[PDB]
């Protein structure tokens, strides 16, 4: 295996080293704004030496934005799908390439056969070519790896069945900002190219000025190059006609041939486009040439790629007929001059990348090798797009949500070939789709209208409902004896109980589980554990008594915790934040112990006073002014205080101090060490009140943020055995602190109610010797070291916070995992901060149209993890990579990947069983089975199951770390007759396995397996 650590790759663009070196200047290019006056030798091409160019129309359909997926479908692209069958059709030389699977399976799903044949034949002679091939064209900041995974999959395994292609190149024009992930995925996807656009302007001006913008794009911490992948940057500031064809605006619009008036759309730059003739052709193709050339001027061989398209384009066959016309009457003069040296030709993206390589292999050209990240995007000025890291924030914590939910489902119900009237496909299917769509560059961004963001949430609700169908029936079969097992596929006999989603506060979601001497005595709860390892979790459930036990089904007593249910309101009458105790609802809380990728099986007791194993919290109010806050039976009177400063211990775990306004202030590791200062603190970034407008897309703020006035908060302690918590209702934030042991857990219930033109953000403030420097996440993949800059505005320091950040000295680290993508940055040594939502007034001039005034409560959920890293073996100052350690990750998990929580939902479960998985390996705790997907329906006499297997890279810190067993996926299911290694999509087999045994992955790795069992 590489060492991901120790060997800084020798890269001859380094983009954080890069970004350390560029002055950034804004400077007015000319009509090339943000470049320069490109000059070219009219001597480079000549009779033995062409310019290849090739026109590659296209239109970008977005799954949603303005409209929702289907008003698009019914009002655009069902139209452009229609009239590109007939114009490809009716003329053989034209070319199309498409990119959104979503929309073109639902067009070609509804088509009559005929016209079904004459698609198939118009993609098999290489008329209308499919790029990337997945289900969107999605979000590349916010999205995680395996949603990214999730839909590529889906689109290309739609296009496989029913076109019979898999793209090897990808098409990715309008997300805002581009990351590695991309072609780390698609590489191992069988992909050998792929194109970007969004970029920074100074940027695209340094790396066109070197001819660097196609570039073997390998993986940062990549020595070899082995995750290379060719990428093409397009260098101006849109995909648009006006700049694809050459620096110049004004002259590439007027070869956008449906801006002449009747079509309703114009040059902004003034001259409009004119119908070709020849009386006007040489003059035209005089223009047009000289654009190209200079293009052309910017990149290393001699075949041009112009792009001829934009959004939502060739919907009506007039539009089809002026641009092919007109383009072809340029063409026959242009290819027929030999003083141009041109051939120029309408073409696809592939054959635009094989005319490249061909150029290469003939040694024409050699291409720099580029590693790093192009976040944060910023399209002109200053207008950095770092807002919609953080836009629309209840939806970006539902992705996480149903990212886990899709991978839980699609696990439990592999382990059996089911019916077809048990509907497991359809319903995966439809969860799949929903989640998929939703990684749009429009749709997890939180870059879509209000009626739109409200069509994703619906989809997403029925795609969880899905998923929760098809576990708890799963659960039912996998526990109950067969011979007992009766199942009614439309039957619940359970429901899931999730305790951060929506989440309390947010929504009353979540069933209590009725228990009565004179009804019920007792409940069977089952918990799931995704990840291949044993894992013990505390897992809480509301009960109807505080009198309640806890058993495994060896009828082993488990120590459990009872606290009250609090309950936060905001109380118009007295005007303040303050929370209210159930005297009927309890939970009861007690630690899970789960096989690898498995199930276990309590019980809930209720009995008439104490019991034995059951401890009951207490519970310290702590404000002027309180009233009494009964709670029934719950045993232990709720106790008062003035506001003060309070510290807490679980178990052998760290000891936290609190302000008296509820805030940490310091965490201590053990008995003897420091109380190292780390802080909470809550601010508020306001908006310009004059110039640029703060919206969905641009964070613009009207200077560093304001700390957020508290008042006099109330503060609700809860001091208990196995879990306490420190809970502070503050203004727009109910903000908790949750010890269980280890590293605390922090839920925000945040309402930014109507307060306009504010972010609220959540920083930690340390001693942290930091300096500049400081740590992101990318996709939830891999961690890139950031270097704050102090010649960029405060929002170019903003980068995605998808999963993780974390800032550290020589000896000392500070890490915050979080359960949603958000915005962040680290603005000076020792702070770490994290967007939580923002309301804005206005719109931000790029096409949204509304500001972002559709806010509702959101429970952002994290782990923060404080750790001596003196220790540990680091990469050296120059790698541009970072790395989690053991516990760090294992928080991560924890928010991202919890136990499943099942409650039996009739009187009494006949047949049930205790555990499931007890045989399962127990795998090294850097290796994830990311997927788990049976491939075949019950009808298919091969079953096949595929696996995603991923190892992450964790610091070495002098832990022993031990004990576990090899994983072999191949193994996991029984009578396997063949086990390959396939591309991530599955679609591609790459390695027939000796011994059908699936060899486990190197740091930082993923591979794909698919067992087939007789
Ligand atoms: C699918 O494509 C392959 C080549 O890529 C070809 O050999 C095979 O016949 C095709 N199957 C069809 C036409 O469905
Ligand atoms: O995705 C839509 C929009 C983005 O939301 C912002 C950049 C311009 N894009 C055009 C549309 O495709
Ligand atoms: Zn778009």
């Known amino acids: 295996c590489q060492d991901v650590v120790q060997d800084v790759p020798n890269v001859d663009v380094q983009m954080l080293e890069l970004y350390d070196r560029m002055s950034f200047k804004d400077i007015d290019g000319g009509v090339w704004k943000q470049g320069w006056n490109i000059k070219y030798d009219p001597l480079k091409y000549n009779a033995h030496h062409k310019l290849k160019v090739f026109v590659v129309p296209h239109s970008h359909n977005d799954p949603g934005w303005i409209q929702t997926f289907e008003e698009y479908y019914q009002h655009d692209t069902k139209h452009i799908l229609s009239n590109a069958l007939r114009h490809l059709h009716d003329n053989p030389e034209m070319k199309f390439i498409w990119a959104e699977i979503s929309y073109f399976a639902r067009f070609y799903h509804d088509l009559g056969e005929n016209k079904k044949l004459q698609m198939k034949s118009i993609v098999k002679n290489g008329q209308l070519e499919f790029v990337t091939g997945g289900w969107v064209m999605p979000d590349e900041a916010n999205s995680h790896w395996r949603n990214v995974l999730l839909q590529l999959t889906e689109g290309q395994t739609w296009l496989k069945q029913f076109m019979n292609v898999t793209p090897t190149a990808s098409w990715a024009i309008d997300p805002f900002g581009h990351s590695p992930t991309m072609p780390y995925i698609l590489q191992k996807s069988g992909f050998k190219n792929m194109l970007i656009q969004r970029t920074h302007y100074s940027v695209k001006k340094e790396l066109a000025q070197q001819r660097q913008l196609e570039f073997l794009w390998r993986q940062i911490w990549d020595n070899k190059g082995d995750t290379a992948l060719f990428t093409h940057m397009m260098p101006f500031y849109s995909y648009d006609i006006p700049h694809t064809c050459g620096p110049d605006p004004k002259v590439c619009c007027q070869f956008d041939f449906k801006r002449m008036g009747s079509f309703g759309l114009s040059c902004p730059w003034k001259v409009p486009p004119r119908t070709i003739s020849d009386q006007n052709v040489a003059a035209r193709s005089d223009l047009l040439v000289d654009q190209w050339k200079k293009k052309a001027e910017l990149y290393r061989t001699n075949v041009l790629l112009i792009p001829l398209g934009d959004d939502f384009r060739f919907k009506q066959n007039t539009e089809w007929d002026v641009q092919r016309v007109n383009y072809e009457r340029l063409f026959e003069h242009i290819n027929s001059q030999a003083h141009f040296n041109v051939q120029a030709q309408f073409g696809t993206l592939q054959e635009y990348f094989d005319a490249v390589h061909q150029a290469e292999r003939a040694g024409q050209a050699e291409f720099p090798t580029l590693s790093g990240d192009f976040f944060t995007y910023a399209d002109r000025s200053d207008n950095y797009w770092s807002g919609y890291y953080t836009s629309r924030p209840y939806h970006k914590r539902m992705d996480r949500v ?59 609700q029925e795609a969880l409902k899905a998923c929760q169908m098809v576990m708890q029936q799963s659960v039912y079969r996998l526990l109950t004896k067969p011979s007992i097992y009766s199942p009614d596929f439309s039957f619940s006999y359970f429901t899931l109980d999730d305790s951060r989603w929506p989440g309390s506060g947010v929504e009353d979601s979540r069933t209590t589980i009725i228990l009565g001497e004179d009804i019920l005595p007792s409940k069977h709860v089952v918990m799931h554990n995704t990840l291949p390892h044993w894992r013990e979790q505390l897992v809480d459930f509301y009960v109807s008594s505080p009198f309640v036990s806890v058993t495994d089904l060896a009828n082993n007593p488990v120590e459990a915790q009872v606290s009250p249910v609090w309950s936060w309101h905001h109380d118009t009458l007295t005007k303040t934040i303050h929370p209210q105790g159930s005297t009927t609802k309890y939970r009861i809380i007690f630690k899970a112990r789960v096989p690898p990728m498995g199930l276990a099986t309590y019980v809930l007791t209720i009995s008439d006073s104490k019991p034995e194993h059951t401890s009951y919290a207490s519970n310290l109010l ?16 709720v106790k008062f205080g003035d506001p003060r400063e309070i510290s807490l211990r679980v178990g052998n775990g760290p000891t936290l101090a609190f302000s008296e306004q509820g805030l940490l202030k310091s965490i201590q590791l053990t008995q003897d060490s420091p109380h190292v200062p780390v802080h909470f603190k809550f601010l508020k970034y306001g908006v310009r009140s004059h110039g640029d407008r703060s919206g969905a897309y641009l964070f613009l703020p009207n200077g560093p943020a304001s700390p957020v006035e508290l008042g006099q908060p109330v503060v609700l302690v809860t001091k208990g055995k196995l879990e306490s918590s420190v809970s502070v209702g503050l203004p727009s934030v109910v903000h908790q602190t949750i010890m269980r042991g280890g590293a605390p857990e922090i839920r925000n219930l945040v309402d930014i109610g109507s307060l306009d033109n504010t972010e609220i953000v959540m920083r930690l403030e340390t001693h942290i010797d930091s300096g500049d420097i400081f740590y992101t996440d990318l996709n939830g993949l891999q961690f890139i070291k950031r270097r704050r800059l102090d010649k960029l505005p405060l929002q170019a320091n903003y980068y995605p916070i ?44 790029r096409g949204l149209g509304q500001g972002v ?126 086990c390959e290694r396939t591309t991530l999509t599955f679609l591609q087999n790459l390695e027939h396995l000796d011994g059908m045994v699936a060899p486990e992955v190197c740091p930082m790795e993923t591979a794909a397996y698919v067992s087939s069992h007789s």
């Open 402 to 460: 149903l990212m886990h939910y899709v991978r839980a489902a699609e696990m439990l119900s592999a382990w059996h070939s089911w019916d077809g009237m048990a509907r497991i496909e359809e319903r995966l299917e439809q969860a799949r789709r929903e989640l998929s769509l939703f990684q749009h560059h429009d749709g997890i961004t939180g870059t879509a209208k209000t009626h739109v963001v409200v069509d994703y949430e619906q989809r997403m």
């Open 802 to 845: 998808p999963s993780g950040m974390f800032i550290e000295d020589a000896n000392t680290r500070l890490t915050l995992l979080t359960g949603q993508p958000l915005g962040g940055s680290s603005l000076a040594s020792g702070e770490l901060e994290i967007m939580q939502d923002r309301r804005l007034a206005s719109d931000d001039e």
């Open 853 to 978: 005034l559709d806010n509702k409560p959101v429970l952002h959920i994290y782990r923060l993890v404080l750790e001596k890293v003196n220790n540990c073996v680091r990469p050296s100052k120059l790698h541009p990579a970072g790395y989690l350690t053991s516990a760090a990750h294992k928080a991560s998990q924890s928010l991202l990947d919890p136990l499943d929580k099942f409650i039996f939902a009739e009187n009494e479960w006949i047949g049930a069983q205790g555990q499931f998985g007890g045989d399962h390996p127990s795998a090294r705790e850097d290796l994830d089975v990311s997927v788990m997907r049976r491939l075949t329906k019950s009808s298919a006499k091969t079953q096949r199951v595929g696996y995603v297997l991923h190892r992450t890279n964790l610091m070495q810190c002098g832990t022993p770390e031990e004990h576990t067993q090899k994983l072999d996926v191949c193994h996991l299911l029984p009578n396997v007759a063949r």
């Open 622 to 637: 702590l404000r002027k002014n309180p009233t009494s806050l009964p709670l029934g039976q719950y045993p232990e009177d």
